[PDB]
Design a protein around this ligand. Structure first.
Ligand code: CHL
Ligand code: CHL
Ligand code: CHL
Ligand code: CLA
Ligand code: CLA
Ligand code: CLA
Ligand code: CLA
Ligand code: CLA
Ligand SMILES: CC(/C=C/C=C(C)/C=C/[C@@]12O[C@]1(C)C[C@@H](O)CC2(C)C)=C\C=C\C=C(C)\C=C\C=C(C)\C=C\[C@@]12O[C@]1(C)C[C@@H](O)CC2(C)C
Ligand SMILES: CC1=C(/C=C/C(C)=C/C=C/C(C)=C\C=C\C=C(C)\C=C\C=C(C)\C=C\C2=C(C)CCCC2(C)C)C(C)(C)CCC1
Lengths: 209, 150, 39, 202, 193, 184
C-alpha cells in the first residue's frame, strides 16, 4: 500500500486501518496503542480547528481584498473588539467556560468509551455515545447522518477529512510565517507572486524561515 | 515601639539608606545616554530599589538605630513577619513529607520495592502529589486511627 | 518507548525535570512579586 | 407507560404515566416532570385549587370595580394604588385580624387534607356538621348550600382557575410595564390593536 | 448521581448528598467519613441561617422595608461589651456543642435516666425537640438540607471574597452586574483568579 | 431514468420515491431517518418557491418585488398574525412526521377527520378537486418544484446583480443577448 517514504516499509504499529496512515512516526511517539488513540484525536481536532481557521482567513482576506471593509486576520481582533461594544477578559473567560465544558466532556470519552452516554445531563442519552474515537456522530455531531449512511461513503471521508486537516494545518502556519517574514495579507502574498513569481519568492526577503 | 526600635515608615537612618543606594546608581547613570540600553536598567533598578523601600514603609516593619528592618517573632502589630509564613512552611514541608510517606508505603508491598525508589512510578507519585494537598486532615485522622506508628 | 519513558522516569532525570520546575516557580514569583520580607 | 385515549395538549405526543386522568383537569401536561412522585401530586393537586380560587376571586375583585367605576357608581380607584391609605382601621391591624381568622380556618382545612374525615363537624354547636364528603379540597355541606352535587363541574373549576391565575400574572406584568388598570390597557389595545402589541410597547 | 460523569467514583462511596465527590480521598477512612458528614451538616445549617440574615435583610433594604446596615458593618452600636457578648456566647454554645460532641461519640449518650428525652434519632439528625412540627414516606428533606447548604456555604465564601474585590454589598454587586453584565465581571476588577 | 444517462444510481436510490433520478453525490439520503426528513423539506421548499416565483412574476405583471418590504396594520402588528398562524400550522405538519398519523382530527368539529394518507401529501380538505391522477402528479410536483426553486435563486441573484426583477432582466437579455450574461 502507498507510504510517506516509498521503499522504506511502514512501522509495525501502523496497520493501514486508520485514515491517512502513511507509515510515518519516524520518532516512535505513537507506539503504545493508547498513546496513539490520544494523538488520532489531537490530529483530528487540530486539523478541524486549522480547517475552520484556514477557511476563516481565506474568506475574510478575499473579503478585505474584494472591498475595503474587512480587516486583515493579524490586526482583526482589536478591530472586532474596539469597534464593537465588547471587552477581551470576559470573552477569553466566557470562551474558557463553554470550551471548558465542551472539552471536559470529550476529555471523559477518551478514557471511558460510552461514558457521557448515560443520559446524566439533559436526558440526551444516545447523542453522546462513543461510536469511533474521533467521530462522535448522532443527531448533534453528524446531523444529516453521513455517520449512519454507508460503509465505504463514510470511510472515504475520514481519508478526505484528515488530509484536508493536515493541508489546512500547513496552510494556517504559512499564513502565520508569511505575515511574519513579509508583513502583508495572504492575497497580497498571492497577488505579488502571480504577477512576478520568478522574483517574488522567499529568495528576495523571506530567508531560510 | 517594641524593644524601643523606631518604625521604618518614620525612621531617619532608613530614609538616608534610601538616599545613599539611589545616589550610588545616579552617579553611574551619568556615564550613559538616556536612550541607551544600560540606562533603562540603572533607571529600572532605581525605580525597583526606590519602590522596595516604599513597600516596607507601607508594610510597617520596625527599623533600628542601624537603619535596617528588624523582625518580631512572638504574638499583634507584626503577625505577617514570621507567625503567618511559619504555617506556610509546616504545610508545604508536611505536604512533601506525607506525599513521600504515602509513596514509600504504597510501593512497600510489591515484591521488589527498591526498583520504585529509582525507576519511580511517576503516575503513582503524581496521584499521591494531589492527594497530599489535604494532608493535615489525613495526618490527624491517621494519628487518631492508630496506623501512624510502629 | 516503554523503555525510553522508564529512563525518563529514572531518579536523576525526574529530580532535574522536578528542580527546573520548583526553581523557575521561585524565580518567576520573585519577578512579578520582587523583594519579599513579608508574605 | 402513558394513557392512549384521553385529553392531550400536544395531540400525538405522550402523556407520561403518573397523569392517569385521575385528578380534575388532567390532559397530562408536566414537561418538567414535577408530578412524578404521587406524594407530591397530592400537594400540588390541592395547591392548584387554593391558588386557583384566590386568583378567580382576586381577578373579579380587580376587574369588576373598574367595569362599574367606568359605568360610574360608590368608591372606585386603581387595584394597586387602592390599598395605599384610606380605611377605618390602620394597615397593621387589618392584617392581624386577617392573619388570625385565617390561621384558624387554614389549620382546620390542613388537618382535613392530612386525615380525610378529621374536621367535618362543628366543635361548639356540635350537632352541626358538614357531610361525609371524604374529598379534601372539595369538602361540601355549608360550602355547597344550593347543592350542585359532577366530573363536568370539577373540570370547569380548575380550567377557570388556570385562566384566572394567568390573568392575575398578566395584571402584575401589565401594570409593572404600562402603569394603568387592566381595563385601561384593554381600551388602548382595542382603539388600535395592531400598533399596540407587547412588541410595539417594548 | 455523579459530580463528573465518566470519572470513576472512588470505591469508599457505595451510595450510603453522595454525588461521588472526594478527589483527595479524605473519607476513605469510614471513621473520618461519619465525622466529616456532620461537619458538613453543621456547616450547612449555620451558613443557610447566616446568609438568610445577609440576603433577606440586604434585599428588603433596597425594597425599602428595613433600614439595615451592610453585613460587614453590622458589628460596630451601644448596649453591652463585645467581650461579654463573645464570652456569654462562647460560654452558652460550648455547653450545647459538648452535648452534640458526646452524641457524635456515643449516639444515645444524651438520654441518661438521671431531664434527657433529647436521646437521639439517627447520626446528625437529632429531631424530637429540634423538630416541633415533626416531619418524617418522603425523606427528600434530608437531601435539599445538604444541597441548599453547600449552595449557601459557597454563597458566603463569595460574599467574603466579592467585598474584598469590589468593596460593596452583594445586593449592589447583583445590580452593578445586572445593569451592564458584560463590562462588570469577575474579569473587570482588582484580581484575576 | 437518470440525471446523468449511463450512470448507475447510488445504492440507496431505487426509483420508489417521486423524482428519484439517482442523485446523491454526498449520500445525503443515505440514512432512512434523514432521507424521510429531506423528502419533506424538498416538497415544502418547492411548494414555497412555486408559490413565491408564481407571485414575483404575476405581482410585476409594477414595482421591485425586492423593495416590496416597503408597503395599514404596522410591521409588528402583521409579523404577530403571521407568527402565531405559521407557528400553529407548521407544528401540526411537524407532528405528522413526529408520528405518521398523530394529527388528522379537527380539534373543534371533531366530526370531521382527514383520511389515512402518506406523509407530506395530506389531502382530504386539501385535495378538493382530486384533479389529474396518481403519482405522475407528485412527479410533475417535484419537477415543476425544483425548476421553481432554482428560478427563485435566479430571481435573487438577478435582483442583486442587475437591480431589476425577472421579466425586465429577460427583456434586458433579449436586447443584447451576446452582452447581457454573467460573462459580462
Ligand atoms: C489560536 C489562537 C489565537 C491566535 C493565534 C491569536 C492571535 C492573535 N490575536 Mg486573538 N488569537 C487567538 C485566539 C483568540 N484571540 C481572541 C481575542 C483577541 C483579541 C481581543 C485581540 C486578539 C489579538 C490577537 C493578535 C495579538 C498580536 C500579537 O500577539 O502580536 C505580537 C494575534 C495576531 C489582538 C489584536 O488583534 O492585536 C492586533 C486583539 O486585539 N485576539 C480570543 C478570545 C475570543 C481568542 C480565543 O481563542
Ligand atoms: C462567626 C463569624 C463572624 C464573622 C465572619 C464576623 C465578621 C466580622 N465582624 Mg463580627 N464576625 C463574626 C462573629 C462575631 N462578630 C462579633 C462581634 C463583632 C464586633 C464587636 C465587631 C465585629 C466586626 C466584624 C468585621 C471585621 C472587619 C473586617 O474584617 O473588615 C473587612 C467582620 C465583617 C467589626 C465591625 O463590625 O466592623 C465594621 C467589629 O468591631 N464583630 C461577635 C460577638 C462577640 C461574634 C460572635 O460570634
Ligand atoms: C420569509 C421570507 C422572506 C424573504 C425571503 C424576504 C426577503 C426580503 N425582504 Mg422581506 N422577506 C421575507 C419575509 C418578510 N419580509 C417582511 C418585511 C420586510 C421589510 C419591511 C423589508 C423586507 C426586505 C426584504 C429584502 C432584504 C434585502 C436583501 O436581502 O438584499 C440582499 C429581501 C428581498 C427589505 C426590503 O424591502 O429590501 C429592499 C425591507 O426593508 N421585508 C415581512 C413582514 C414583516 C416578512 C414576513 O414574513
Ligand atoms: C520521604 C522522605 C522522608 C521523610 C518523610 C523523613 C522524615 C524524617 N526525617 Mg528524614 N531523611 C530523608 C527522607 C525523609 N525523612 C532522606 C532522603 C534523608 C537523607 C538525606 C534523610 C535524612 C535524615 C536524617 C539524617 C534525619 C532525618 C530525620 C527525620 C525525622 C525528623 C525531621 C527531619 O529532621 O527531617 C523525620 C521523621 C531526623 C530524625 O530522625 O529525627 C534526622 O536526624 N532524616
Ligand atoms: C446565626 C445567624 C445570624 C447571626 C450570627 C446574626 C447576627 C446579627 N444580626 Mg441577624 N439575622 C439572622 C440571622 C443571624 N443574624 C436571620 C435569620 C435574620 C432574618 C432573616 C436576620 C435579620 C437581622 C436583622 C433585620 C438585623 C440583624 C441584626 C444582626 C446583628 C445584631 C446583633 C443581634 O441581632 O443581637 C448581628 C451581627 C441587626 C443589625 O443590623 O445590627 C438587624 O437590624 N439580623
Ligand atoms: C470535677 C469537676 C468538673 C469538671 C472539670 C467538669 C467539666 C465539664 N462539665 Mg461538668 N459536671 C461536674 C463536674 C465537673 N464538670 C459535676 C460534679 C456534675 C454533676 C452536677 C456535672 C454535670 C455536668 C453536666 C450535666 C454537663 C457537664 C458538662 C461539662 C463540660 C462543659 C463544657 C462547657 O460548657 O464548655 C466540661 C468538660 C456539659 C457537657 O459538656 O456535657 C454538660 O452537659 N457537667
Ligand atoms: C454561590 C454562588 C454565587 C453567585 C450566584 C454569585 C454571583 C455573582 N458574583 Mg460571585 N462569587 C462566588 C459565588 C457566587 N457569586 C464565589 C464562591 C466567589 C469566590 C471565588 C465569588 C467571587 C466573586 C467576585 C470576585 C465577583 C463576584 C461577582 C459576582 C456577580 C457577577 C458574576 C461574577 O463575577 O461571578 C454575580 C451577581 C462580581 C461582581 O460583584 O461584579 C465580582 O467582582 N463574585
Ligand atoms: C407566499 C407567497 C407570496 C407572498 C409572501 C407574497 C407577498 C406579497 N404579495 Mg403576492 N402574490 C403571490 C404570492 C405571494 N405574494 C402569488 C402566488 C400571486 C399570484 C400569482 C401574487 C400576486 C400578487 C399581486 C398581484 C400583488 C401581490 C402583492 C403582495 C404584497 C402585498 C400584501 C398582500 O397581498 O396583502 C406582499 C409582499 C401586492 C403588492 O405587492 O402590493 C400586489 O399587488 N401579490
Ligand atoms: C465554603 C465552605 C466549604 C468549602 C469546602 C469544600 C469546597 C470542600 C470540598 C472538598 O472536601 C470535598 C467535598 C472532597 C475533597 O476530596 C476535596 C474538597 C474540594 C476539599 C464553607 C463555608 C461556610 C460558611 C459559613 C458557615 C458562614 C456563616 C455565616 C455567618 C454565621 C456569619 C455571620 C454574620 O453574617 C451574619 C449572619 C450577619 C452579619 O451582619 C454579621 C456576621 C457576623 C458577619
Ligand atoms: C508558636 C510559635 C512559637 C513557638 C513554638 C513552640 C514552643 C513549639 C513547640 C513544639 C513542640 C513541643 C513540638 C512537639 C512535637 C512532637 C512530636 C512527637 C512530633 C511528631 C511529628 C510527627 C510524628 C511527624 C509526622 C509526619 C507528618 C505529619 C508529615 C510528614 C511525614 C512525617 C512522617 C514526618 C515561636 C515563638 C517559636 C515562634 C512564633 C510561633
Amino acid at each position: 500500500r502507498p507510504v510517506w517514504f516509498p521503499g522504506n516499509p511502514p512501522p509495525a504499529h501502523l496497520d493501514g486501518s486508520l485514515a491517512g496512515d502513511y507509515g510515518f512516526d519516524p520518532l516512535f511517539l505513537g507506539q503504545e496503542p493508547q498513546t496513539l488513540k490520544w494523538y488520532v484525536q489531537a490530529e483530528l481536532v487540530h486539523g478541524r480547528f486549522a480547517m475552520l481557521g484556514a477557511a476563516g482567513i481565506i474568506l475574510t482576506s478575499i473579503g478585505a481584498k474584494v472591498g475595503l471593509g474587512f480587516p486583515e486576520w493579524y490586526d482583526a481582533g482589536k478591530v472586532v473588539v474596539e469597534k464593537n461594544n465588547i471587552d477581551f477578559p470576559t470573552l477569553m473567560v466566557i470562551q474558557f467556560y463553554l470550551m471548558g465544558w465542551a472539552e471536559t466532556k470529550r476529555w471523559y470519552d477518551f478514557k471511558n468509551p460510552g461514558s457521557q452516554a448515560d443520559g446524566s445531563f439533559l436526558g440526551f442519552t444516545e447523542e453522546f455515545k462513543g461510536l469511533e474515537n474521533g467521530y462522535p456522530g448522532g443527531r448533534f455531531f453528524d446531523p444529516m447522518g453521513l455517520s449512519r449512511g454507508d460503509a465505504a461513503k463514510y470511510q472515504e471521508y475520514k481519508q478526505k477529512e484528515v488530509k484536508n486537516g493536515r493541508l489546512a494545518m500547513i496552510a494556517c502556519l504559512g499564513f502565520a510565517a508569511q505575515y511574519a517574514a513579509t508583513g502583508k495579507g495572504p492575497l497580497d502574498n498571492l497577488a505579488d507572486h502571480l504577477a512576478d513569481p520568478n522574483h517574488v519568492n522567499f529568495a528576495t526577503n523571506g530567508v531560510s524561515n | 515601639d517594641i524593644a524601643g526600635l523606631t518604625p521604618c515608615s518614620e525612621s531617619k537612618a532608613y530614609a538616608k539608606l534610601e538616599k545613599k543606594e539611589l545616589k550610588t546608581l545616579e552617579k553611574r547613570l551619568k556615564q550613559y545616554e538616556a536612550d541607551s540600553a544600560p540606562a533603562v536598567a540603572l533607571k529600572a533598578t532605581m525605580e525597583r530599589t526606590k519602590a522596595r523601600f516604599a513597600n516596607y514603609a507601607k508594610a510597617g516593619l520596625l527599623c533600628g538605630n542601624d537603619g535596617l528592618p528588624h523582625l518580631i517573632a512572638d504574638p499583634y502589630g507584626h503577625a505577617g513577619e514570621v507567625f503567618i509564613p511559619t504555617f506556610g512552611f509546616l504545610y508545604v514541608a508536611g505536604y512533601i513529607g506525607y506525599v513521600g510517606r504515602q509513596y514509600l508505603i504504597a510501593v512497600k508491598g510489591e515484591a521488589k520495592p527498591t526498583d520504585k525508589e529509582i525507576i519511580i512510578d511517576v503516575p503513582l507519585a503524581t496521584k499521591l502529589a494531589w492527594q497530599g494537598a489535604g494532608w493535615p486532615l489525613a495526618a490527624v485522622q491517621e494519628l487518631q486511627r492508630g496506623t501512624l506508628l510502629e | 518507548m516503554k523503555d525510553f519513558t522508564t529512563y525518563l522516569s529514572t531518579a536523576p532525570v525526574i529530580a532535574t525535570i522536578w528542580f527546573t520546575f520548583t526553581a523557575g516557580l521561585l524565580i518567576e514569583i520573585n519577578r512579578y512579586f520582587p523583594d519579599p520580607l513579608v508574605f | 407507560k402513558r394513557d392512549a385515549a384521553l385529553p392531550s395538549w400536544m395531540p400525538g405526543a405522550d402523556l407520561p404515566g403518573y397523569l392517569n386522568g385521575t385528578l380534575p383537569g388532567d390532559f397530562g401536561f408536566d414537561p418538567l416532570y414535577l408530578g412524578q412522585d404521587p406524594v407530591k401530586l397530592k400537594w400540588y393537586a390541592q395547591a392548584e385549587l387554593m391558588n386557583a380560587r384566590f386568583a378567580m376571586l382576586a381577578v373579579a375583585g380587580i376587574l369588576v370595580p373598574e367595569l362599574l367605576s367606568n359605568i360610574g357608581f360608590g368608591a372606585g380607584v386603581a387595584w394597586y394604588d387602592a390599598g395605599k391609605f384610606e380605611y377605618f382601621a390602620p394597615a397593621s391591624s387589618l392584617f392581624g385580624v386577617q392573619m388570625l381568622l385565617f390561621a384558624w380556618v387554614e389549620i382546620r382545612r390542613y388537618q382535613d387534607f392530612v386525615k380525610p374525615g378529621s374536621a367535618n363537624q362543628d366543635p361548639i354547636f356540635t350537632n352541626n356538621k358538614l357531610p361525609d364528603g371524604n374529598e379534601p379540597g372539595y369538602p361540601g355541606g355549608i360550602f355547597d348550600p344550593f347543592g350542585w352535587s359532577i366530573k363536568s363541574l370539577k373540570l370547569k373549576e380548575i380550567k377557570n382557575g388556570r385562566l384566572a391565575m394567568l390573568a392575575f400574572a398578566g395584571f402584575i406584568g401589565q401594570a409593572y410595564t404600562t402603569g394603568t388598570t387592566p381595563l385601561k390597557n384593554l381600551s388602548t389595545h382595542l382603539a388600535d390593536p395592531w400598533s399596540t402589541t407587547v412588541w410595539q410597547n417594548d | 448521581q455523579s459530580w463528573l460523569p465518566g470519572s470513576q467514583i472512588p470505591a469508599h462511596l457505595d451510595t450510603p448528598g453522595n454525588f461521588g465527590f472526594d478527589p483527595l480521598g479524605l473519607g476513605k477512612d469510614p471513621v473520618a467519613l461519619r465525622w466529616y458528614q456532620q461537619a458538613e451538616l453543621i456547616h450547612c445549617r449555620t451558613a443557610m441561617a447566616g446568609v438568610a440574615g445577609i440576603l433577606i435583610p440586604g434585599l428588603l433594604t433596597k425594597a425599602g422595608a428595613l433600614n439595615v446596615p451592610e453585613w460587614y458593618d453590622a458589628g460596630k452600636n451601644s448596649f453591652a461589651p463585645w467581650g461579654s457578648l463573645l464570652a456569654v456566647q462562647l460560654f452558652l454554645c460550648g455547653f450545647v456543642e459538648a452535648k452534640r460532641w458526646q452524641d457524635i461519640r456515643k449516639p444515645g449518650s444524651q438520654g441518661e435516666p438521671g431531664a434527657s428525652l433529647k436521646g437521639t434519632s439517627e447520626l446528625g439528625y437529632p429531631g424530637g425537640p429540634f423538630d416541633p412540627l415533626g416531619l418524617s414516606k418522603w425523606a427528600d428533606w434530608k437531601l435539599k438540607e445538604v444541597k441548599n447548604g453547600r449552595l449557601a456555604m459557597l454563597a458566603f465564601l463569595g460574599f467574603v471574597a466579592q467585598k474584598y474585590a469590589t468593596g460593596a454589598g452583594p445586593v449592589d454587586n447583583l445590580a452593578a452586574h445586572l445593569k451592564d453584565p458584560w463590562h462588570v465581571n469577575y474579569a473587570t476588577n482588582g484580581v484575576s483568579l | 431514468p437518470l440525471w446523468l444517462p449511463g450512470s448507475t444510481p447510488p445504492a440507496h436510490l431505487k426509483g420508489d420515491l417521486p423524482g428519484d433520478f439517482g442523485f446523491d453525490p454526498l449520500g445525503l439520503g443515505a440514512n432512512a431517518e434523514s432521507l424521510k426528513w429531506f423528502k419533506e423539506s424538498e416538497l415544502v421548499h418547492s411548494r414555497w418557491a412555486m408559490a413565491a416565483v408564481a407571485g414575483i412574476l404575476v405581482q410585476e405583471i409594477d414595482v421591485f418585488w425586492y423593495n416590496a418590504g416597503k408597503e395599514p396594520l404596522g410591521p409588528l402588528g402583521l409579523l404577530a398574525v403571521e407568527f402565531f398562524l405559521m407557528h400553529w400550522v407548521e407544528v401540526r405538519r411537524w407532528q405528522d412526521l413526529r408520528k405518521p398519523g398523530s394529527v388528522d382530527q379537527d380539534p373543534i368539529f371533531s366530526q370531521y377527520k382527514l383520511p389515512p394518507h402518506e406523509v407530506g401529501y395530506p389531502g382530504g380538505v386539501f385535495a378538493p378537486f382530486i384533479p389529474g391522477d396518481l403519482a405522475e402528479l407528485k412527479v410533475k410536483e417535484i419537477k415543476n418544484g425544483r425548476l421553481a426553486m432554482l428560478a427563485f435563486v435566479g430571481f435573487v441573484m438577478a435582483a442583486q446583480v442587475t437591480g431589476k426583477g425577472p421579466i425586465a432582466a429577460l427583456q434586458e437579455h433579449l436586447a443584447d443577448p451576446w452582452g447581457t450574461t454573467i460573462f459580462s
